[PDB]
Scaffold this active site. Structure first.
Site, PDB file in Angstrom:
ATOM      1  N   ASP A   1      14.772  71.719  54.622  1.00 16.18           N
ATOM      2  CA  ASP A   1      15.780  71.335  55.592  1.00 16.18           C
ATOM      3  C   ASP A   1      15.129  71.357  56.966  1.00 16.18           C
ATOM      4  O   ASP A   1      14.625  72.398  57.402  1.00 16.18           O
ATOM      5  CB  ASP A   1      16.979  72.275  55.542  1.00 16.18           C
ATOM      6  CG  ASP A   1      18.016  71.923  56.565  1.00 16.18           C
ATOM      7  OD1 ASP A   1      18.427  70.749  56.585  1.00 16.18           O
ATOM      8  OD2 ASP A   1      18.410  72.795  57.361  1.00 16.18           O
TER       9      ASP A   1
ATOM     10  N   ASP B   1      15.491  71.133  60.886  1.00 19.49           N
ATOM     11  CA  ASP B   1      16.452  71.280  61.979  1.00 19.49           C
ATOM     12  C   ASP B   1      15.704  71.116  63.298  1.00 19.49           C
ATOM     13  O   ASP B   1      15.360  72.082  63.978  1.00 19.49           O
ATOM     14  CB  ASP B   1      17.192  72.598  61.880  1.00 19.49           C
ATOM     15  CG  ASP B   1      18.060  72.676  60.623  1.00 19.49           C
ATOM     16  OD1 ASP B   1      18.163  71.656  59.896  1.00 19.49           O
ATOM     17  OD2 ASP B   1      18.607  73.766  60.342  1.00 19.49           O
TER      18      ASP B   1
ATOM     19  N   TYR C   1      29.717  70.584  65.836  1.00 23.88           N
ATOM     20  CA  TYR C   1      30.192  71.779  66.525  1.00 23.88           C
ATOM     21  C   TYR C   1      29.348  71.943  67.781  1.00 23.88           C
ATOM     22  O   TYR C   1      28.480  71.121  68.084  1.00 23.88           O
ATOM     23  CB  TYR C   1      30.161  73.042  65.635  1.00 23.88           C
ATOM     24  CG  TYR C   1      28.934  73.191  64.740  1.00 23.88           C
ATOM     25  CD1 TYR C   1      27.697  73.528  65.274  1.00 23.88           C
ATOM     26  CD2 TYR C   1      29.018  72.983  63.367  1.00 23.88           C
ATOM     27  CE1 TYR C   1      26.582  73.650  64.479  1.00 23.88           C
ATOM     28  CE2 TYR C   1      27.898  73.100  62.562  1.00 23.88           C
ATOM     29  CZ  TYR C   1      26.683  73.432  63.127  1.00 23.88           C
ATOM     30  OH  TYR C   1      25.558  73.557  62.340  1.00 23.88           O
TER      31      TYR C   1
HETATM   32  C1  LIG Z   1      24.294  77.680  67.364  1.00 26.36           C
HETATM   33  O1  LIG Z   1      22.905  77.462  67.439  1.00 26.36           O
HETATM   34  C2  LIG Z   1      22.524  76.365  68.245  1.00 26.36           C
HETATM   35  O2  LIG Z   1      21.733  76.465  69.114  1.00 26.36           O
HETATM   36  C3  LIG Z   1      23.181  75.022  67.983  1.00 26.36           C
HETATM   37  N1  LIG Z   1      23.306  74.615  66.719  1.00 26.36           N
HETATM   38  C4  LIG Z   1      23.929  73.447  66.738  1.00 26.36           C
HETATM   39  C5  LIG Z   1      24.214  73.069  68.031  1.00 26.36           C
HETATM   40  C6  LIG Z   1      24.948  71.713  68.107  1.00 26.36           C
HETATM   41  C7  LIG Z   1      25.758  71.358  67.036  1.00 26.36           C
HETATM   42  N2  LIG Z   1      26.279  70.167  67.247  1.00 26.36           N
HETATM   43  C8  LIG Z   1      25.834  69.697  68.429  1.00 26.36           C
HETATM   44  C9  LIG Z   1      26.125  68.477  69.047  1.00 26.36           C
HETATM   45  C10 LIG Z   1      25.555  68.199  70.267  1.00 26.36           C
HETATM   46 CL1  LIG Z   1      25.961  66.640  70.985  1.00 26.36          CL
HETATM   47  C11 LIG Z   1      24.693  69.103  70.895  1.00 26.36           C
HETATM   48 CL2  LIG Z   1      23.951  68.754  72.487  1.00 26.36          CL
HETATM   49  C12 LIG Z   1      24.408  70.311  70.266  1.00 26.36           C
HETATM   50  C13 LIG Z   1      24.990  70.616  69.014  1.00 26.36           C
HETATM   51  C14 LIG Z   1      23.751  74.082  68.871  1.00 26.36           C
HETATM   52  C15 LIG Z   1      23.778  74.204  70.428  1.00 26.36           C
HETATM   53  C16 LIG Z   1      23.738  73.135  71.314  1.00 26.36           C
HETATM   54  N3  LIG Z   1      23.756  73.580  72.570  1.00 26.36           N
HETATM   55  C17 LIG Z   1      23.786  74.946  72.566  1.00 26.36           C
HETATM   56  C18 LIG Z   1      23.806  75.878  73.638  1.00 26.36           C
HETATM   57  C19 LIG Z   1      23.839  77.246  73.387  1.00 26.36           C
HETATM   58  C20 LIG Z   1      23.845  77.695  72.070  1.00 26.36           C
HETATM   59 CL3  LIG Z   1      23.904  79.452  71.719  1.00 26.36          CL
HETATM   60  C21 LIG Z   1      23.831  76.771  71.028  1.00 26.36           C
HETATM   61  C22 LIG Z   1      23.792  75.374  71.258  1.00 26.36           C
END
Ligand SMILES: COC(=O)c1[nH]cc(-c2c[nH]c3cc(Cl)c(Cl)cc23)c1-c1c[nH]c2ccc(Cl)cc12
Ligand SMILES: *[C@@H]1O[C@H](CO)[C@@H](O[C@@H]2O[C@H](CO)[C@@H](O)[C@H](O)[C@H]2NC(C)=O)[C@H](O)[C@H]1NC(C)=O
Ligand SMILES: *[C@@H]1O[C@H](CO)[C@@H](O)[C@H](O)[C@H]1NC(C)=O
Length: 540
Positions: A291, A293, A370
């Protein structure tokens, strides 16, 4: 009456009874010293027959099958190779012209990382989790984080394994120091931990971030000092022995571990990375593929100085080469392997990659629907993971529907898209100046008080505090998202609840999508995963 004078009964001597095809150093901190892979173990046995004929023939049998044959009538020894793990009954047989004698059987354990030497994982369903049967044909996935075994106290034996089709192990790092993994420096101790694990290891190879949690920590059923594989990896081996059809995938990267992917414009680095993944899956055989990421191709991840429009083609090449590797790995092992990846759900990142060219190598796309909103901004409040746009902002493009339809509009197959579900809330504090009794129209003064990090709350705690009357619960029936609010202090939290999860499962089914997946499994009290199964049509 007969003429039958077989040799005396051989007596086996005292010896080592535990062997390992993949050797693990239980006191090592660097990956190159932690694990040594081979393609067989070396088993040895000694026997004795008081006054026997040294011209007799000798055979060593493992579960009534021959693994060694030579001579050694009166006192002998043997060494041989075992290529597949398990618990074996070892017998020394001696023969002369008349007949054969057989040792008493002695048990040996030949350990291998497919769990063949271990019992199935013992589980009982806890908290609100209810048992389901995977009859829908949809993906029901969830991320297991490696560090959840410390203050979260969520080892693998707490995973509701009947209710899953996929388990994603977060996270597998890529070796690299200054300039290569700078994003890790935002987490205390995390960069230095990777450098210790990657000590003496070439950059751009996969490794293990925390070898203690992964392989050496005592867990339920894996506590003996001489257990070859403990920690998360040993428990995931036992999980495969309990649910062989449940796919266990390692996830390379994530938010703070995606920086090295941006150097894969160099095919030399990309070739080394792919070769390390092949070696990684041969070493840890319970894994069922890869996977990826990478957050994100083109940038806008944790590192603000990384990103290029050429990342889209690099991404497609990486997937092509990973599948080619998995194809030749299938030829050697005969197994089927899955290639998957978690991608941003925002159109401004979807556009970077031509997923319809990349989807031909991949089994699933874990749509990260999310983290659309959160406490990284005081002024932009909204739904973290809603299905649709809310009433007061119908043009919101960071919704599950808007991202799904944008990816679909690229020509990605709907059966590969797996919609994301949040087992946590993101929140703000001190929200003020809002109109129309809508707390999202205001501004915050900072993040909400969280469970483990500022601004993020486990769904388990959101549920408990709701039952305790500490929250005003609201469900936006247009956006299909819940939220809790505290008018006094201005505390606001956007999350996924049983209702929005079921609504996402209805959307997946209505549009012929791949299923649902959740981050992260330890923040659930059971309500969310239950709703995923119910929302996708699984049988209770
Ligand atoms: C929880 O773990 C992670 O980092 C993470 N996993 C998935 C996303 C994330 C999931 N769908 C997304 C759709 C868009 Cl469009 C964008 Cl831009 C980011 C995401 C994110 C994350 C983004 N921005 C963050 C800022 C702070 C933190 Cl703690 C986390 C995030
Ligand atoms: C959200 O707003 C708050 C204050 O309304 C900002 O916090 C202030 O800014 C800096 C950040 O450390 C401090 O020096 C001030 O002392 C803070 N005041 C507070 C909140 O006590 C905060 O930075 C904002 N968050 C973001 C990311 O914009
Ligand atoms: C929040 O801050 C933004 C900054 O541009 C401002 O436009 C907005 O009016 C603020 N909200 C309130 C309720 O004052």
């Amino acid at each position: 009456y007969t003429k039958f004078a077989p040799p005396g009964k051989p007596s086996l001597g005292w010896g080592e009874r535990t062997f390992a095809i993949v050797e693990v150093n239980q006191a090592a901190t660097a990956y190159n010293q932690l694990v040594t892979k081979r393609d067989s173990a070396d088993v040895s046995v000694t026997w004795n027959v008081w006054s026997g004929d040294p011209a007799d023939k000798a055979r060593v049998l493992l579960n009534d099958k021959e693994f060694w044959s030579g001579t050694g009538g009166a006192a002998g020894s043997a060494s041989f190779k075992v290529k597949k793990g398990g618990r074996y009954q070892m017998v020394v047989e001696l023969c002369n012209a008349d007949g054969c004698s057989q040792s008493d059987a002695t048990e040996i354990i030949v350990a291998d990382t497919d769990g063949s030497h271990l019992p199935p994982l013992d589980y009982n369903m806890g908290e609100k989790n209810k048992p389901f049967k995977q009859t829908s044909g949809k993906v029901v996935g969830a991320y297991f984080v490696e560090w959840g075994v410390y203050p979260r106290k969520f080892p693998v034996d707490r995973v509701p394994i009947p209710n899953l089709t996929h388990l994603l192990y977060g996270f597998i790092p890529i070796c690299g120091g200054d300039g290569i993994n700078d994003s890790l420096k935002e987490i205390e101790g995390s960069f230095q931990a990777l450098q210790r694990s990657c000590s003496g290891r070439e950059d751009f190879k996969v490794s293990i971030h925390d070898p203690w949690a992964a392989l050496q920590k005592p867990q339920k059923g894996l506590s003996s000092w001489n257990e070859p594989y403990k920690g998360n990896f040993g428990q995931l081996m036992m999980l495969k022995q309990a649910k062989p059809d449940l796919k266990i995938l390692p996830s390379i990267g994530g938010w703070t571990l995606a920086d090295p992917f941006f150097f894969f414009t160099d095919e030399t680095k990309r070739r080394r990375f792919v070769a390390s993944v092949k070696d990684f899956l041969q070493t840890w055989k319970f894994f069922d593929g890869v996977d990826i990421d990478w957050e994100f191709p083109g940038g806008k991840g944790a590192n603000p100085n990384l990103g290029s429009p050429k990342d889209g083609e690099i991404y497609v090449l990486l997937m092509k080469e990973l599948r080619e590797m998995l194809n030749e790995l299938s030829a050697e092992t005969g197994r089927k392997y899955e290639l998957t990846s978690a991608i941003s759900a925002g159109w401004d990142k979807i556009q970077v990659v031509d997923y319809s060219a990349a989807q031909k190598y991949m089994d699933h796309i874990f749509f990260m629907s999310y983290d659309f909103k959160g406490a990284w901004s005081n002024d932009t409040l909204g739904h973290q993971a809603s299905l649709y746009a809310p009433d007061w902002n119908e043009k919101e493009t960071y919704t599950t529907d808007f991202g799904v339809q944008f990816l679909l509009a690229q020509g990605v197959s709907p059966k590969k898209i797996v919609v994301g579900v949040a087992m946590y809330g993101r929140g703000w504090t001190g929200v003020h100046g809002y109109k129309d009794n809508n707390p999202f129209t205001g501004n915050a003064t900072g993040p909400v008080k969280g469970t483990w990090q500022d601004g993020v709350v486990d769904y388990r705690e959101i549920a408990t505090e709701i039952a305790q009357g500490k929250w005003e619960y609201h469900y936006d029936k247009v956006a299909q998202a819940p939220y809790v609010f505290r008018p006094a202090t201005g505390d606001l939290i956007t999350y996924d609840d049983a209702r929005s999860t079921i609504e996402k499962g209805k959307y997946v089914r209505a549009n012929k999508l791949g299923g649902l997946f959740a981050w992260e499994i330890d923040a659930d009290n059971g309500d969310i995963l239950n709703a995923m199964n119910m929302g996708l049509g699984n049988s209770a």
